[PDB]
């Protein structure tokens, strides 16, 4: 017999963290829904699709003033995207659940008054538990960099599922984070401020996408402990437990050829706009694929179709060097690969005409996206 | 249809990164579900 | 060989109205485009779909800065949502069309020059001509509150192609604006400023959802004309020709039963929200009924389902009349009928169990919302 | 299927009168289309 009176605009922005995980494609009944568990001065939010898992202790005072007031302590499982769409439409500023024998819930805010069927805790699966060494303390500011430069080039399909991960290799005060579908590359270095320990985890994909929303954009540390199997998260009162995937992820490392014919200093609002719009003519075929032709101070952004025509755009690339080259990429793995860059002027760099080109911000050595090429045979 | 099944996909996979905004891949997706809809009562 | 060059921040506001007529699922491959035509003082951009047909005359000047310098007259077919797609995304605030023979436009806009593969306009259809006698002034307030307030009810089925339409019934200087479904009725009654004749017309329910939209709000008039097949919509420096239904509209004055039972006060914003919650429960269902029970001073809108479990809000009417009253409605026909209300406080009346019930609001006694009863047989 | 469609249509007309925000009707037109794939790589 749970029954806690939470405040209603603190628990919706502290329940829609845990609804990400709860996926509505898991084979049990019991994972697609919220476990809510009341404790004697704080309530938990454990859920789960059997490959993430957040469990987020909303604590009875929040930076002084009051959320929870826990009148019976207990834990129901709620059905997970409902009681969620129910939090959001209620009325008052108080939500009182209050949870009887066979576990039906009365959601009472002001007038309204649900009455859900929650499903016994019991048989909701054990959290994973983490060992609390293998301590690594990045900040929210800096790990939602890692995640938004590198996990864009994950895989989405799972023949190969390790390329569908964000590889973390840890060795000597020193974080690689990259990522790759076989098209893509984005190696983030980073330095820690600590020593760790060799590690070569691989991060799932809809791992981290859906830890950068959980994140808000605060001062606060992630101290992200590893296990053998699991990753957690722990970012200022909210878990994340993710299971890390199997396997030897493939290097990478002879990936990154050099030489560079030529070297652009190009802008990024311009050159990611341009190819916004140099793709809309392909796109609407189906594929989107840009000819590139570099010129003296120009990057000469074509494109062409049957039955619709040309686009052709200008773009000035500030800083030119070696001759002129026509490369055929991808626009999507352009527009992701610049909208990754902080910064506003990018430093692209092509290997020939058949080979991946980087693109890497100038003034920062640390994180360099590649493209591999898809021009043609 | 697989023509447009690729253009959707295609338009999805430029959304899911914010390279395009929520209302015209919403109306594009109603699009879609007009042509499965059609492609489900022609089968 | 037509050539201008028109702000692009006006010629998208003004090319987003003319995109609303093109309906991409038109037989004829030439009424899926825009024909651009540049004359020497103006450009209109008439958009159809042989039900509907917009045409938009951008002059020279418009509020006293300069739009259009046409440099050549002429015309052009481009493709219809494509075109709209290329003017949104490019970067300079002109826009510079440049049609050559074969009809292949270069839309040249700073840096950015496209160049698509417009159609021959000599192959487009002729507008509808519609007769400039029988001439009704609205104002755009006024008719963007009959649109709201009448055009939310009418038919979705072509199985009957005349309740798919909004009659317009005037007679004797009233304008009496119906729209049925044979589950809603939306009587709006309004008095013109002038004499006009016996006009018996349907007007289609989504030749006036999109007129809704291409009118902003001011203080200017639309002159409409009448004719025996089609209407004319002349807003400010905008026409929109939209075709008459044929056939006799339904005598809708048989569904208004007298001698109320109970008589409802109730606030707009509350029971509007109450039918949001309370069919939350009963439209995960598929079906959205809101089984609603009047009491003294509280109105206990009720549902309940298997497996999900019962909600019950209590919204406070500020004056009820008879006695309590268990009637069982649609929740989507209540929360539309209660969004057209501009007033904050509708006066719901019920008659009986299993009759239709009047939802207009106080003070206003021409608009009548009616509700026909879904309630069980 | 027709469970599922019936529940998206019923959210759709619940849109197309702005009783419903477009976030909401655009993961479960996501959803449904999901949904319409599976049932055409059954058949």
């Known amino acids: 017999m749970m029954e806690f009176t939470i405040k209603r605009d603190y628990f919706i922005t502290q329940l829609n963290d845990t609804l990400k995980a709860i996926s509505p494609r898991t084979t049990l009944p019991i994972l697609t829904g919220i476990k809510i568990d009341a404790k004697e001065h704080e309530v938990i939010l454990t859920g789960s699709d059997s490959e993430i898992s957040i469990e987020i202790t909303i604590p009875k005072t929040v930076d002084g003033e009051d959320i929870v007031n826990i009148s019976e302590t207990g834990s129901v499982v709620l059905p997970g995207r409902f009681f969620v769409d129910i939090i959001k439409k209620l009325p008052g500023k108080d939500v009182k659940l209050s949870t009887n024998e066979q576990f039906q819930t009365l959601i009472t805010s002001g007038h309204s008054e649900f009455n859900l069927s929650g499903l016994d805790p019991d048989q909701y699966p054990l959290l994973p538990q983490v060992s609390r060494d293998d301590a690594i303390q990045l900040s929210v500011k800096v790990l939602k960099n890692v995640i938004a430069q590198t996990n864009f080039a994950v895989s989405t399909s799972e023949t190969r599922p390790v390329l569908t991960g964000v590889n973390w290799l840890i060795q000597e005060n020193e974080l690689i984070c990259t990522a790759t579908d076989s098209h893509r590359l984005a190696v983030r270095k980073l330095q820690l401020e600590d020593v760790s320990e060799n590690k070569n985890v691989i991060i799932p994909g809809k791992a981290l996408a859906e830890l950068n929303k959980i994140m808000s954009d605060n001062e606060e540390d992630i101290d992200i402990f590893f296990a053998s199997n699991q990753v957690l998260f722990k970012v200022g009162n909210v878990n994340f437990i993710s299971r890390l995937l199997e396997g030897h992820y493939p290097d990478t490392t002879r990936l990154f050829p050099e030489n560079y014919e030529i070297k652009l200093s190009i802008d990024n609002g311009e050159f990611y706009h341009a190819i916004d719009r140099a793709s809309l003519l392909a796109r609407e075929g189906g594929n989107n694929v840009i000819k590139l032709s570099t010129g003296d101070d120009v990057v000469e952004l074509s494109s062409t179709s049957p039955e619709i025509g040309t686009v052709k755009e200008e773009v000035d690339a500030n800083d030119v060097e070696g001759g002129s080259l026509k490369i055929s990429f991808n626009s999507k793995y352009m527009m992701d690969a610049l909208k990754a860059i902080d910064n506003d002027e990018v430093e692209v760099e092509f290997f020939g005409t058949m080979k991946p080109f980087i693109l890497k911000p100038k003034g920062d050595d640390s994180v360099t996206q590649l493209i591999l090429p898809i021009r043609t045979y | ?43």
């Open chain 2, 1 to 43: 249809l697989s023509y447009y099944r690729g253009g959707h996909k295609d338009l999805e996979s430029m959304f899911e990164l914010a390279l395009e905004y929520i209302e015209k891949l919403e109306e594009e997706d109603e699009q879609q579900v007009t042509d499965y809809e059609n492609a489900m009562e022609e089968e």
